[PDB]
């Protein structure tokens, strides 16, 4: 708005060229206007478990707090340990919805990229 968002390197972005990512992201957003296409990767330096899958298609009214719980169970992070999301190297508010987060932070390929970590700074 009206900025193009550029974030850190993701292995997804390295392995799928921009033109293919943008074609797919434009299609999924047209097909599902109220679902958010999210790429989730572990930050390189994080000392917690990896995810099986990295592509999530979620509700735009899902809260970030709800998405935290989802990722946490999927990496089997013990409840006592902290988990943090970074989008464009910023920690989003836990009260935001995935829809608001997408609107603010999506990249030019129409995807939203989230790195997760056990550290609260990066």
Author numbering: 1 to 122
Question: From the publication, what sentences describe this entry?
Answer:
All six mATG8s are essential for autophagy, are conjugated to autophagosomes and serve to recruit two broad classes of molecules: autophagy receptors and autophagy adaptors. On the other hand, autophagy adaptor proteins interact with mATG8 proteins on the convex autophagosomal membrane surface and can regulate autophagosome formation (ULK1/2 16), autophagosome transport (FYCO1 17), crosstalk with the endocytic network (TBC1D5 18) and autophagosome fusion with the lysosome (PLEKHM1 19), but are themselves not degraded by autophagy. Structural studies have shown that the side chains of the aromatic residue (Θ) within the core LIR motif are placed deep inside of a hydrophobic pocket (HP1) on the Atg8/LC3/GABARAP surface, formed between α‐helix 2 and β‐strand 2, while side chains of the hydrophobic LIR residues (Γ) occupies a second hydrophobic pocket (HP2) between β‐strand 2 and α‐helix 3 (reviewed in 3, 23, 24).
To obtain the complex structures, we created chimeric proteins consisting of the mATG8 C‐terminally fused to the LIR sequence with a Gly/Ser linker. Crystals diffracted to 2.50 Å for PLEKHM1629–638‐LC3A2–121, 2.00 Å for PLEKHM1629–638‐GABARAP2–117 and 2.90 Å for PLEKHM1629–638‐GABARAP‐L12–117. W635 interacts with E17 in GABARAP and GABARAP‐L1 with distances of 3.5 Å and 4.3 Å. Our structural analysis revealed that PLEKHM1‐LIR residues in positions of X1 and X2 also participate in the binding and could be important for the subfamily‐specific interaction's network (and EV4 and results in Appendix). Residue N637 at the X2 position formed more preferential contacts for binding of the GABARAP proteins due to better geometry of an intermolecular hydrogen bond to an invariant arginine residue in all GABARAP proteins that is lysine in all LC3 proteins. V51 GABARAPs’ side chains are in close proximity to the PLEKHM1 V638 (3.8 and 4.3 Å for GABARAP and GABARAP‐L1, respectively), while side chains of residues in equivalent positions of LC3 subfamily proteins are further away (LC3A/B/C V54/V54/V60 – 4.2/4.6/4.6 Å).
